């Protein structure tokens, strides 16, 4: 095991660290539950452990191999961050991906000092610090989500995003569930296979189910208000309308014969007794607030009916007061009867929302020509006639579908092409198709075979935060470092250009070394967009690397782009022709061509 470990506790949560003497592997965790920390302690099974002198719960580490105690001064975050930065030779640890874990870094600082004391031999072999996560959801960094425009576009607007194309859900609860599914894509095949079977099964009956689902409305807010006992009289009537709607939905789903569809039908429930209580107890159109009165319906309580009669044909005003008090007590009693079934109702609201998201996904699939994706065991992506989900909808002109094949035999493709050729659209189409397959939706391609994807990494933007202290090359190099350090054989790494900030020679050199490292050692599935044609000579030298070229045809001054992926290198990017289309003055384009001839000639 050869594993040295550290543990920390504070108000925010628990922090943990691991260091392997044999492999120089340094990792940190921030498990926020006592039980999770206990499971993590067993799963790590560390040879030695270090804990705070004032650790609150020693029971988690009560019996451990070579358990030891070190002082609080060693655990301080500011001292720990400086030592870690110096050991790795980095200004900040944002590149390693561990900068935002305060508790994890504090435990790591104690382990680094202890590790140096126990052996100075391992110290030169410690070069990185990474978080530990085998989370079911595919891991996506904040930058990848904004770059892929999963829910919010780069400007910050709701439109032109993947969620805008797929979010036509009838009910507000459904729209929230789809957005949550897009942000966390489940990697377990069994849950996705159940969702895909429901989407195909309910495809025929989407028109019958959606009107009834729209009537149900948002039940999540009504049920949460019921839990705090602040539900309005009108909100209880809304719940009664959904109870009346549930028999209709169940009858429609009964004809369908899919095990996932039938399970969702049972979870929805009928709640006939709750419907009977609400119908008898509440008037057809109840008032906005319970204070005025008239919420309770006659026949729910005999005494109330009698007091109401006395109130309406000064002593009579006292009888009116008695009636209002009896009514309010009956209303509080109504919450008491409904609340025992609150856990059951919460399961039903989730079941109704899942039906809305899946019925919506099925309608979107028929309208937009999507097809089911078939999962495979080894890490590879194959797409035939693939299209970008967002671009196809917003583009008046036709979309030209491009094929993709990635396997452990052909892991890296260097896409080279003319400017405005479609290289970035092709790389993003792979990322959105992989995420759409992994949420259980139907992919926008004729056929897709998607293998396990641990994490999706997107390096596209080049921006500088001067106040933060990082230039455009440092911001780009920080993202490249996170790709190289945190990448796995399963990861899909999409890199849109590298060395766009430095001189041509330094940039080509980093691009050549980063491309070699991703194919040779990381062995991740990589798509690399490049305007350096020197890198198109990499595929012959290194195995697993192939060249993909987008096609353009030049006639006179103007250029036409095919948008078609073919094998080859391109070797010419028509930058000056794209500049003239952008509107650069003719005299500037003419001078530029004259200089271009001189540079190539010598």
Decide which of Mg ion, ligand ANP, a copy of itself, none touches 102; Cβ closer than 5 to 8 Å per partner kind.
none
Q: Which stretch binds a copy of itself (CB under 8 A): 131-139, 245-253, 255-263, 419-427?
A: 419-427
Q: Which residues, 6 or more positions from 270, have their beta carbon under 8 angstroms from its beta carbon?
A: 243, 246, 247, 250
**How many CB atoms are closer than 10 A to CB 476?**
24
Least distance in angstroms from the C-beta of 482 to a copy of itself: 8
Decide which of ligand ANP, Mg ion, a copy of itself, none touches 587; Cβ closer than 5 to 8 Å per partner kind.
a copy of itself
Least distance in angstroms from the C-beta of 262 to a copy of itself: 32
Which of 485, 489, 562, 566 lies at the binding interface for a copy of itself (CB under 8 A)?
485
Q: Which is nearer to ligand ANP, 187 or 382 (CB)?
A: 382
**How many CB atoms are closer than 10 A to CB 548?**
24
- From CA 251, how far away is CA 146, in angstroms rounded? 42
Which of 70, 116, 145, 232 lies at the binding interface for a copy of itself (CB under 8 A)?
232
With binding defined as CB under 8 A, does residue 349 bind a copy of itself? no
3-class DSSP state of 351: helix
Integer CA distances (angstroms), 172 to 149, 326, 457, in order:
21, 36, 31
Least distance in angstroms from the C-beta of 536 to a copy of itself: 11
Integer CA distances (angstroms), 418 to 427, 553, 593, in order:
15, 10, 17
Whether 424 has a binding-site annotation, put simply, is yes
Mask of contacts with a copy of itself, 81-110, x by CB under 8 A?
-------xxxx-xxxx--------------
Decide which of ligand ANP, Mg ion, a copy of itself, none touches 563; Cβ closer than 5 to 8 Å per partner kind.
ligand ANP
Least distance in angstroms from the C-beta of 291 to a copy of itself: 10
With binding defined as CB under 6 A, does residue 420 bind ligand ANP? yes
Q: Which is nearer to a copy of itself, 362 or 518 (CB)?
A: 518
With binding defined as CB under 8 A, does residue 142 bind a copy of itself? no
Q: Which residues, 6 or more positions from 290, have their beta carbon under 8 angstroms from its beta carbon?
A: 232, 233, 328, 331
Can you state the angle between helices 233-255 and 220-227, rounded to 10 degrees?
130
User: Radius of gyration over alpha carbons of the chain, in Å?
Assistant: 31
Q: Which residues, 6 or more positions from 248, have their beta carbon under 8 angstroms from its beta carbon?
A: 212
> Within 13 Å, how many C-alpha atoms sit on residue 397's CB side?
5
Mask of contacts with ligand ANP, 463-492, x by CB under 6 A?
-x-x--x-xxx-------------------
Pairing, β 381-386 against β 492-496: unpaired
Which of 90, 424, 488, 509 lies at the binding interface for ligand ANP (CB under 6 A)?
424
Site for a copy of itself in 2-41 (CB under 8 A): none
The helix (run of H) or strand (run of E) holding residue 326 is helix 315-338
Q: Which stretch binds ligand ANP (CB under 6 A): 202-210, 224-232, 325-333, 420-428?
A: 420-428
Site for a copy of itself in 493-512 (CB under 8 A): 497, 499-510, 512
- From CA 27, how far away is CA 181, in angstroms rounded? 28
Decide which of Mg ion, ligand ANP, a copy of itself, none touches 42; Cβ closer than 5 to 8 Å per partner kind.
none
Which of 198, 402, 416, 478 lies at the binding interface for ligand ANP (CB under 6 A)?
402
Nearest to 563 by CA among 446, 383, 399, 389: 399
Q: Which is nearer to a copy of itself, 121 or 285 (CB)?
A: 285
How many chain residues interact with a copy of itself (CB under 8 A)?
Answer: 108
Which of 297, 400, 508, 592 lies at the binding interface for ligand ANP (CB under 6 A)?
400
Which of 325, 395, 513, 542 lies at the binding interface for ligand ANP (CB under 6 A)?
395
Least distance in angstroms from the C-beta of 500 to a copy of itself: 5
Beta bridge partners of 375: 450
Site for ligand ANP in 534-593 (CB under 6 A): 563
Instruction: Record the tokens describing residue 48, joined without a space.
Output: 């030695």
User: Between vectors from CA 346 to CA 342 and to CA 351, what angle results, nearest 5°?
Assistant: 145
Least distance in angstroms from the C-beta of 464 to Mg ion: 6
**How many CB atoms are closer than 10 A to CB 149?**
21
What sign does the CA torsion over 507, 510, 512, 515 have?
A: negative
Site for a copy of itself in 350-389 (CB under 8 A): 388
Which of 153, 197, 262, 424 lies at the binding interface for Mg ion (CB under 5 A)?
424
Question: Are 455 and 138 within 8 A, CB to CB?
Answer: yes
Site for Mg ion in 76-115 (CB under 5 A): none
Which of 33, 332, 465, 554 lies at the binding interface for a copy of itself (CB under 8 A)?
465
Decide which of a copy of itself, ligand ANP, Mg ion, none touches 306; Cβ closer than 5 to 8 Å per partner kind.
none
Q: Which residues, 6 or more positions from 39, have their beta carbon under 8 angstroms from its beta carbon?
A: none
Mask of contacts with ligand ANP, 494-533, x by CB under 6 A?
-------x--------------------------------
Tell me the longest C-alpha to C-alpha distance in the chain: 111
Whether 396 has a binding-site annotation, put simply, is no
Breaks (C-N over 2.5 A) in the chain follow: 313
Whether 420 has a binding-site annotation, put simply, is yes
Residue number of the CB closest to ligand ANP reads 422
Q: Which is nearer to a copy of itself, 410 or 531 (CB)?
A: 531
Decide which of Mg ion, a copy of itself, ligand ANP, none touches 417; Cβ closer than 5 to 8 Å per partner kind.
ligand ANP
Q: Which stretch binds ligand ANP (CB under 6 A): 39-47, 204-212, 432-440, 461-469?
A: 461-469
Integer CA distances (angstroms), 112 to 90, 194, 475, 538, in order:
16, 46, 27, 39
**In sequence order, what DSSP letters do the residues of 183-239 get, joined into one string?**
HS-B--HHHHHHHHHHHHHTSTTHHHHHHHHHHH---HHHHHHHHTT---HHHHHHH
Whether 423 has a binding-site annotation, put simply, is yes
- From CA 189, how far away is CA 440, in angstroms rounded? 9
Site for a copy of itself in 577-596 (CB under 8 A): 578-589, 591-593, 595-596
- From CA 542, how far away is CA 520, in angstroms rounded? 8
Residues tagged in the binding site annotation: 417-424
- Chain residues binding ligand ANP by CB under 6 A are 391, 395, 399-400, 402, 417, 419-425, 464, 466, 469, 471-473, 501, 563
Residues that bind Mg ion (CB under 5 A): 424, 472
């Amino acid at each position: 095991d050869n594993l040295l470990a550290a543990i920390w506790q504070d108000s925010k949560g628990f922090g943990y660290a691991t260091l392997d003497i044999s492999s120089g592997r340094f990792r940190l965790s921030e498990p926020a539950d006592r039980e999770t920390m206990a499971a993590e302690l067993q799963r790590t099974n560390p040879a030695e452990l270090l804990y705070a002198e004032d650790f609150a719960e020693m029971s988690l580490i009560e019996g451990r191999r070579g358990l030891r105690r070190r002082p609080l001064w060693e655990f301080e975050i500011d001292t720990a961050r400086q030592q870690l930065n110096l050991q790795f030779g980095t200004r900040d640890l944002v590149g390693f991906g561990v900068e935002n874990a305060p508790r994890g870094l504090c435990a790591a600082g104690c382990l680094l000092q202890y590790a140096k004391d126990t052996q100075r031999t391992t110290l030169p072999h410690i070069r990185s610090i990474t978080m530990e996560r085998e989370q079911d959801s595919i891991i996506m960094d904040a930058a990848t989500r904004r770059n892929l425009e999963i829910t919010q576009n780069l400007a910050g607007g709701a439109e032109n995003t993947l969620a805008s194309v797929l979010d036509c859900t009838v009910t507000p609860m459904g729209s929230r569930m789809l957005k949550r599914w897009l942000h966390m894509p489940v990697r377990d095949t069994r849950v996705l296979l159940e969702r895909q079977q429901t989407i195909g099964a309910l495809q025929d009956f989407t028109a019958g189910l959606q009107p009834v689902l729209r009537q149900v409305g948002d039940l999540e807010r009504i049920l949460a208000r019921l839990a705090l006992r602040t539900a309005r009289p009108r909100d209880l009537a809304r719940m009664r309308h959904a109870f009346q709607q549930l028999p209709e939905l169940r009858a429609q789903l009964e004809t369908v014969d899919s095990a996932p569809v039938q399970a969702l039908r049972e979870k929805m429930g009928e709640f006939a007794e709750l419907r009977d209580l609400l119908e008898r107890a509440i008037i057809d159109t109840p008032p906005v607030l319970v204070r005025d009165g008239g919420v309770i319906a006659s026949g729910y309580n005999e005494e109330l009916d009698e007091w109401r009669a006395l109130a309406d044909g000064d002593k009579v005003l006292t009888s009116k007061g008695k009636a209002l008090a009896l009514e309010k007590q009956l209303y509080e009693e109504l919450f008491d009867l409904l609340l025992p079934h609150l856990e059951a109702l919460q399961q039903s609201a989730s079941a109704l929302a899942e039906l809305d998201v899946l019925v919506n996904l099925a309608e979107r699939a028929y309208t937009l020509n999507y097809t089911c994706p078939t999962f495979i065991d080894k890490p590879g992506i194959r797409i035939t006639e693939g299209r970008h989900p967002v671009v196809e909808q917003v583009l008046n002109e036709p979309f030209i579908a491009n094929p993709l094949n990635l396997s452990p035999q052909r892991r890296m493709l260097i896409i080279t092409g003319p400017n405005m050729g479609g290289k970035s659209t092709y790389m993003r189409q792979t990322a959105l198709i992989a995420l759409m397959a992994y949420i259980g939706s139907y992919v926008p391609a004729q056929k897709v075979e998607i293998g396990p994807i641990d994490r999706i990494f997107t390096r596209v933007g080049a921006a500088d935060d001067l106040a933060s202290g990082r230039s455009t090359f440092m911001v780009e190099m920080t993202e490249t470092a996170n790709i190289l350090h945190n990448a796995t054989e399963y990861s899909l790494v999409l890199m849109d250009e590298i060395g766009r900030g430095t001189s041509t020679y330094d940039g080509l050199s980093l691009a050549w070394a980063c491309a070699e490292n991703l194919a040779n050692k990381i062995k991740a599935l990589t798509l690399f967009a490049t305007h350096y044609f020197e890198l198109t000579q990499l595929p012959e030298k290194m195995e697993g690397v192939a060249n993909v070229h987008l096609d353009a045809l030049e006639h006179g001054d103007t250029i036409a782009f095919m948008h078609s992926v073919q094998d080859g290198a391109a070797s010419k990017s028509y930058g000056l022709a794209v500049a003239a289309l952008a509107g650069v003055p003719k005299e500037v384009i003419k001078r530029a061509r004259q200089k271009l001839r001189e540079l190539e000639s010598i």
